[PDB]
């Protein structure tokens, strides 16, 4: 196990029990000394995993539509950049079957039940497999570890029945999650100061590298 820009204080609380543990904490935030609200190390690990998961989702999803916007029957009205979808109205909207506000409140009602149930499981672990939920509670039990609940829903294919399987798989998961997180950050800043869209922008970069980051030095918009 290799270490990057470690700290003696940081190394103490980062010995390796967590996946992706590279001892990198130059600002010392997972210190089990000052654990209080939202600074406790378990919560920070959970947050890294969940952010990485949502970022993997959103990072293959934001680049998707404008890729097959070039290949296949997929029309061009269905082929937006990730910022023209209506997320940022002053940058482009669309007309779905709903209003983009009812869309939002329906989205957040559904996400509300899913997120609240997930939190109810983080706090008192194993509480969601107790109350009735149109059946389906026997599958929402959990596994003691919040970031890795398992069960018939969140692990139907049964990957990693031994635990070095789970070890290296968790390592791969958190590594791809970090990759997707900084990918999304690149998406954001690049779509701002270049304002093109990542897929199409990547194609312009592969034409030939004349168009370097400095070239859009000038902040077109």
């Amino acid at each position: 196990r290799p270490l990057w820009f470690a700290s003696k204080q940081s190394l103490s609380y980062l010995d390796g029990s967590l996946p992706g543990d590279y001892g990198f904490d130059p600002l010392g935030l997972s210190d089990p000394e000052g654990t209080g609200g939202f600074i406790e190390p378990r919560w920070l690990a959970y947050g890294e995993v969940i952010n990485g998961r949502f970022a993997m989702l959103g990072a293959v999803g934001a680049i998707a539509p404008e890729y097959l916007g070039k290949v296949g029957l997929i029309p061009q009205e269905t082929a937006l950049a990730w910022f023209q979808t209506g997320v940022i109205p002053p940058a482009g909207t669309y007309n779905y079957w709903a209003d983009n506000y009812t869309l939002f409140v329906l989205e957040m009602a559904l996400m509300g039940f899913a997120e609240h149930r997930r939190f109810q499981d983080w706090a008192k672990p194993g509480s969601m497999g107790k109350q009735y939920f149109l059946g389906l509670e026997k599958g929402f039990g959990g596994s003691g570890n919040p970031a890795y609940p398992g069960g018939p829903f969140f692990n139907p294919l049964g990957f990693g029945k031994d635990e070095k399987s789970l070890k290296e798989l968790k390592l791969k998961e958190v590594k791809n999650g970090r990759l997707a997180m900084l990918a999304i950050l690149g998406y954001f800043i690049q779509g701002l100061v270049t304002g093109v869209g990542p897929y199409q922008n990547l194609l312009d970069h592969v034409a030939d590298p004349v168009n370097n980051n400095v070239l859009t030095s000038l902040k077109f918009h």
């Binding site: 204080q9 935030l29 000394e33 000052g34 209080g36 600074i39």
Partner: peptide, 10 residues
């Protein structure tokens, strides 16, 4: 010696 966030709960 080093500087960190140090809290007390409730």
């Amino acid at each position: 010696p080093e500087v960190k966030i140090l809290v007390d709960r409730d």
